[PDB]
Design a protein around this nucleic acid. Structure first.
Lengths: 374, 185, 374, 160, 185
RNA sequence: GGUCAAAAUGC
RNA sequence: GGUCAAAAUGC
């Protein structure tokens, strides 16, 4: 008539499996006050504090399970009409050491995604918090500093009628965690860099409103009296000279109602803004579909002859750069029927088929990178 | 791989208090957190410290997970008006993972070379993730690498310069989200 | 770049599956104060109140899941040495209508089990709360009255040194729910009755301490000025005459240190207590192994010639019963080295291969059934 | 679950080779195989619940048994229960030493919690006593080399 | 294997008597039993000795059977107020298996470097069991390894620090059942 | 009949 | 490269 406790199944060390419902760990509601200006920290905390925000089916499983060999899945949601737009981002970095920066340079290297709710009414990011292995723990997330920053990069185009709320659904995924380590002296391929290369703003009118971006990319971001930094750059700067194929990601952050055809090419800084003749250069013309927000741009390694310098002193006059630049131009005009400024953000996602000849002793600080209102 | 010879890069430059009263003792004391990026100092004086916003210095401050071998170099540039028959200074160097008295020393060097000395040695970062370590994290009551110093007649053995170099096998992963580094002038 | 919510797996209507750990709904701790006397209600509440007692892995699953096609599994646990003993029971009935009875007659028809912790250090009962179908709900359990009574039937033999606590672990099982309905006029086989047929107490010494139990079993239990009732009896009494094989379950409720060899047989009430000659009747001698607490006894239908009456008036003199009785005797002696009284409880589990000739108009009330201290 | 230096003493450290060496390393993992022995009279009853956690939890944590746990019970004449915790109950290797003061709120190293899942019950004065011995670490991984940390903490003992 | 670079661990720290009468001679004398864990001293003064309850120090005191190679390091941190033109001190180091005069010396170093010196050398434990040795056991009139010192102008060549490290091939077996090690403060 | 117990352990 | 999106609906 007796029961053996020993042969009871109370000692199962396994990763939660189930339906997207069953594997729901939390529900965070984030607030998007209609007077939001851009560069605004909507909520910066600890992941573990983000996940511990509701009692949902695998919630205790998150807390009373020591090894989770699956992935944190976010599902965000806020709908905004087509005559306005906000540019939000979820940045997950691996630790915070103090009163840290919440730019976008500084918070987009590990795993972060930008989205204009007017175009993308529901985003889903998945990440692996221990970039070094295949499992995580809540206590890990807790006692290590895993951070989640939710920021506005380019504020409202049109100010909505009342406040808004972004609801992020958090879950554990059905897919395994895969590492992403960096050997600093023997890079991989494709090398993951993820660099905010700039927030390009084109005013309304018939101005070629030509934006030039340095292709020298070590030290990182400039600050008044300081340098801003993210690992994927830290390491790059460990090298001296570089080449490869540069893959850029152009995102629209303004309201699908602000129109422009933007022309991208590759040149040098010695050219005047009135150079009729550039479009006689390899160039690619970009145009955004109403609800289209991401154009991926690929420049091949054949657009560069010789490797270039990883760093160039900050004063080096647009007449002395011997390093290739990434020029963006208005091929037509900026046109709208509502006040607004066309804003598109550029992020260097991966350098593919890289070649790094060298080792950089260093050069003090770096130059500035675009930013501004809304 | 990716390599170049004799290209090391700067991290530390510690200078000794000028105002030092050879009366409340003979020595001055200081430490460098190699894997953290912080110079901790005495109350002996007004110390002049600088950490260099180097490719590496820069890198180690930002990279949350560290596995591998880094190369260190400490150089003593001293007071050269002091006549060599008149030298009274040693400088005791230590290598620990905590700034605790209860922790024990890894390596221990003591150098007493007039006006200048050099010291080249390997440090290796071994940790609990997959062999990866995080700066003084509570996770596996984790630690670092510290290079502390003790200067006797600090008016003589005046300046200290710390350089490190990287190993073909240094691997990082993750971003320790850090404030803006201050750049002089 | 957009996610479809519609094709997301947030609408799964399925019964929780998992490891005994994953399918843990609650943890009830029950208190066994060392001054416990027997007939004591240790805790009488609502199942739903028993299950809602801790946040354990499938706990929210119990609450936010509308159809559970699996079974409530209890695992109880309290260890008591071999020189004492308590007789606890967990009775799960389907509703309570008022200030109800908590005997053992009244609370053991549906699904309940008696256990002496000195012998059985861990019990496991499994039940299906909707005896009418294959699924349950918490809201069901809630708004219908599912009851759980935890009672002491025969108090401590030896009073422990301090208080005790029984911890019941509650879980959802891996096994399906199977109905158990009753047609009252066309019984099944084997008919489930589960009837407390008595609490037989044999004092220490050389007394044949002969206990006779009426085999007439309709109306149920007697009370001072009332009748106590449980469905499996309600229905039996719907019939008039009955036969079949009577399967009895004899449980020890005293400390494994109180010894006796009990002799069971079948006769009539006209015999004197000094009837040398009974053991010349089919009889079966019972003896309990130290840690043995349950002896199942089966009397075959061939021990009865003709069907007997389902009811007999309460006064009918042990000289006028024409209905078979279930006699229990001491074939040796009650012996111990500690004060105690040998107590064994008898429960008629199933009538197998039944024959019911008739329909009972009824007879007012019924007779008494044994009970008492410890 | 930090187990280097050994045993604590008032003003001293107690030591046995198998620990001496362990402490030579810095970080460790593996499967920890524990051996639980009853040392009280078969008449003193208890069901003991073992699991693996951290020190930040309060003693009134209703919710632990929603952790992998294994319930132990001793048969009258049974005195040895062998307990095996698999390496999958730990995510990352832990530190071999932790300073002796490190507050139950600062250990980042896994602990081995034992609890009463019911009660201690007897009919004779007595206290339930069971001794735990880490027999073998199986399928070990030792990343490191420990410079050392002065002394170690205390370990239970007492009368009878 | 199991390895880490530049991680040695402390054993000895011997300090010289302060009360020393430069009259009953010039030298001070002391010894360290590397494989035993004991500092033996003069009657010259009031000596300040300490052995460190190190992972190894700890290990060698407890482990009854020893086969393999251990690495030693002795460091002289000295009196640095003494002007370098005014140094009168040597320190004669010896390596023996007994504290007997009749036994002969294995290695013999003599260092006279002002204020500080370093000395890195291998010791290997070879024994009669299967190549295993036990501290000064009577079994094969067994022995140890001893590091004795002789300090001339001990007021100068003041402090001595002994560190050792282990060899990938150090193998022990057995437990030398030892009393409780004393832990300061 | 349900339940339960059982058809056993170690690397 | 990861992520993501996609290879579509109804009884």
């Amino acid at each position: 008539m007796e029961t053996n406790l020993f042969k009871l199944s109370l000692d199962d060390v396994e990763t939660p499996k189930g339906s997207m419902l069953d594997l729901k760990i939390s529900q965070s509601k984030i607030a998007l006050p209609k007077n939001t200006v851009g560069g605004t920290i909507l909520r910066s905390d600890l992941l573990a504090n983000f996940l511990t925000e509701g009692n949902f089916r695998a919630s205790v499983d998150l807390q009373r399970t020591h090894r989770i060999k699956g992935m944190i899945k976010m599902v965000a949601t806020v709908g905004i009409p087509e005559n306005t737009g906000i540019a939000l981002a979820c940045a997950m970095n691996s630790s915070i050491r103090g009163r840290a920066s919440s730019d976008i340079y500084t918070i987009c290297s590990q795993d972060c995604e930008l989205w204009n709710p007017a175009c993308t009414k529901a985003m889903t990011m998945s990440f692996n918090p221990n970039p070094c292995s295949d499992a995580w723990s809540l206590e890990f997330l807790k006692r290590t500093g895993f951070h989640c920053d939710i920021i506005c990069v380019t504020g409202w185009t049109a100010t909505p009628m009342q406040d808004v709320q972004v609801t992020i659904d958090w879950f554990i995924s059905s897919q395994e965690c895969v590492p992403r380590t960096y050997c600093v002296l023997n890079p991989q391929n494709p090398f993951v860099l993820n660099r905010w290369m700039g927030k390009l703003t084109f005013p309304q009118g018939t101005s070629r409103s030509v934006k030039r971006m340095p292709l020298s990319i070590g030290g990182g971001a400039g600050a008044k009296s300081a340098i801003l930094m993210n690992m994927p750059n830290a390491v790059l700067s460990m090298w001296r000279y570089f080449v490869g194929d540069l893959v850029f990601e152009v995102s629209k952050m303004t309201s699908p109602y602000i129109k422009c055809t933007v022309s991208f090419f590759i040149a040098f800084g010695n050219l005047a803004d009135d150079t009729i003749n550039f479009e006689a250069f390899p160039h690619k013309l970009v145009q955004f579909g109403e609800i289209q927000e991401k154009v991926v741009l690929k420049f091949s390694q054949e657009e560069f002859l010789t490797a270039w310098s990883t760093q160039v002193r900050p004063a080096t006059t647009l007449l002395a750069d011997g390093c290739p630049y990434l020029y963006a131009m208005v091929h037509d005009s900026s046109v709208s029927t509502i006040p607004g400024d066309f804003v598109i953000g550029v992020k260097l996602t991966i350098i593919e088929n890289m070649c790094a000849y060298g080792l950089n002793p260093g050069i003090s600080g770096s130059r500035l990178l675009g930013t501004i209102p809304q | 791989s990716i390599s170049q010879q004799t290209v090391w890069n700067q991290m530390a430059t510690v200078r000794t208090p000028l105002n030092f009263d050879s009366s409340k003792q003979s020595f001055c004391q200081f430490s460098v957190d190699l894997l953290g990026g912080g110079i901790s100092v005495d109350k002996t004086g007004d110390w002049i410290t600088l950490v260099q916003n180097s490719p590496i210095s820069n890198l180690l401050r930002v990279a949350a997970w560290k596995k591998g071998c880094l190369m260190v170099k400490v150089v003593m540039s001293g007071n050269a008006a002091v006549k060599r028959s008149d030298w009274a200074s040693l400088v005791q160097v230590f290598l620990t993972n905590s700034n605790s008295t209860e922790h024990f020393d890894a390596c221990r060097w003591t150098k007493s070379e007039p006006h200048s000395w050099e010291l080249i040695f390997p440090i290796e970062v071994c940790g609990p993730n997959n062999g990866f370590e995080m700066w003084s994290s509570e996770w596996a009551n984790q630690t670092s690498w510290h290079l502390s110093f003790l200067v006797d007649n600090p008016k003589q053995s005046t300046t200290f310069d710390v350089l490190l170099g990287i190993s073909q096998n240094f691997e990082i992963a993750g971003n320790t989200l850090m404030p803006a580094f201050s750049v002089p002038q």
